[PDB]
Amino acid sequence: KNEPVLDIDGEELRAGEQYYVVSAIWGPGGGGLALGRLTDQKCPEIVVQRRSDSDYGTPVIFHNLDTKDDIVRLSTDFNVEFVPIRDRLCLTSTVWKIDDYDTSTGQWWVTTNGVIGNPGPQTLQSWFKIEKSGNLGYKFNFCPSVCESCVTLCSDIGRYGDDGQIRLALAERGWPFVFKKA
Amino acid sequence: KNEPVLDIDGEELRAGEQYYVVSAIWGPGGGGLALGRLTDQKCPEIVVQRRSDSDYGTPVIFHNLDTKDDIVRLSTDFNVEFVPIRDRLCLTSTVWKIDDYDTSTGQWWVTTNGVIGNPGPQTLQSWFKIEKSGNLGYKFNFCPSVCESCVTLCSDIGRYGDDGQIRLALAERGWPFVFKKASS
Amino acid sequence: KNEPVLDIDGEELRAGEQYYVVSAIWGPGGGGLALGRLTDQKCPEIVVQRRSDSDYGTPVIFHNLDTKDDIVRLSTDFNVEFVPIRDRLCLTSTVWKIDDYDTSTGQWWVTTNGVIGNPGPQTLQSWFKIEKSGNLGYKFNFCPSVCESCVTLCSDIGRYGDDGQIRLALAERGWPFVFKKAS
Amino acid sequence: KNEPVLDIDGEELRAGEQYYVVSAIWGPGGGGLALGRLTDQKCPEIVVQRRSDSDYGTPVIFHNLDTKDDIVRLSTDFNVEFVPIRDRLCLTSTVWKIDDYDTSTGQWWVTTNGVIGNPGPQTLQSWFKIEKSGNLGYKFNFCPSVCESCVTLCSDIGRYGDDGQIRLALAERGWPFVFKKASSTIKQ
């Protein structure tokens, strides 16, 4: 019932298809999202943004809450994952998930090894939404509705630098993105 | 019921036929309407006007409220759609529709991805009218009657600069146009 | 008369009013501009950017070329002075100025101890312009017209690291900022 | 009359459109072509190859011999022109050109300051061809047909090291490339 998210070609996003997720602000705003790696805890992989606006990163696939509905819609909990590939060293999933609080940085990082499906308290950290972000594009938001009695974080997803890389983390002012069919 | 809209050859406008929409004011008043886009937005396409009074732009097709009435009449809600070119580069529709208010410019833009048919609250932004704007020539007006209980904007459509281009937006005083059959 | 610059609230920028100068690109793009100090130089103070986009830094005040025009306009030389949020040590001004070339870094830094008014060759390095940065905010440009017979640099202003900090310096492509009323 | 060159999407190459020229061999085969400069000589710029296969280099634009043909075709003379995103560092052009013989290395380098159009003797060094490299790739080749009375070199173009960089030079065996549409931004 909510408005469909559209890709840059004006086509409604479909769960199951592959989309690049690319900053709506180019230049110093950067490029697309991709799996990255930390040197100490090399698994799971982390979510990073390419610095070059000509690099669209790695595509993601959306998994709707309601598997009867093919269309990705605003303000509707979904799971999102980078396109699964055998990693040369990780067996964790590529599904996005909110991490535990990082006292060394003040950040709630978007990481991987999330889970698909089974909405409820157990999977709370794997549910994301999309909101409009001005006229530019769309922002991710973590504010799940899947557990009505749970206390939850409720925040846009923004960008934060860490270890020389650009990571995704909860932030007050969400980062705007657009979607391009892969 | 209402009086028909006439093309520049004095023939009544027929729903379903292609017409260019050309400024009644030539010279600095520009040419015809066409599909355009913005720097920061490939899709949906926007409605623009050619600066050159010899470029009639892209033709449109009118879709009447009453599908049993063939004639485009004054002061009557219709949908209007640009004829799609094949190198489209957008999957949104070419149907005109009023945008959400643009806080960065104070404008209610005319854009596309409108909807044909289903008159009522869901499609309110897609219904336009034609009014007289002289002893000759016409103007577009957004004042839908398809949802009697809906609160609606009710305004002429003028032109307004954006992104180096000439767009259409709601305005107090409408910009005058005439209609040229595209077959001719 | 050129188009007025607007603050993020849509109001025309006014000469004499205090504005934070805040990066139009947030997150790692950082926050606002501030008076700073090099670790090895206490005076003059330099221009730095806060790394955190929640810190809008030190407000500036614009001083127009035309004393009778109160509106800050595009492509028009002005002086910019940091509101003096500082200790009493430096006797130098808080007015922005282009530095002499820095051979150790290859940079032409924005620093302070600039001069207000007296347009001409003597104050050439204290005159700045604002230009639109596409549709995302505004950029500073150093390309003064106060001395038509002078040879002058003509360049956008971008960011560059120095001393563990973020500084401003002449650059090919200007970095985008927005303006917030300090009040 | 010749078959059209295709980009990685399978679409015919279009004269005037921007393309990255990217090695058909990844990893140790490197990335795309770009404008470079020698350490000792700043102008004209030279043609170099990025060592990283994730760096597609500087986009080029093709200018056909036949200005009324929009399609870049096999075995058909064109000019190639780098389109840099930054300000120009030289007053020389960014059009590819075959250099004078380098007695210090034995190479005929691909350099720039070439010329667009005016096919014939004066511009002979600015005309290049694309030929098939097997069946999955393309190679560049210098063998211009624009001056029927001229004596000319006629050779594929390979990679060769110079100045700690990867350059292009005439060679027996041509290096394989593919062509990728270049987009200014995600919204274009």
Automatic annotation (TrEMBL), chain C:
- Gene name on record? LOC111287814
Cysteine disulfide partners in this protein = 43-90, 143-154, 147-150
Q: Which UniProt keywords apply?
A: Signal
The GO terms this record gives for MF are: endopeptidase inhibitor activity
Q: Which species is the source of this protein?
A: Durio zibethinus (Durian)
Query: What protein name applies here?
Result: 21 kDa seed protein-like
Q: Does the keyword Signal apply?
A: yes
Family in the record: Belongs to the protease inhibitor I3 (leguminous Kunitz-type inhibitor) family.
- Can you tell which superkingdom this protein's organism belongs to? Eukaryota
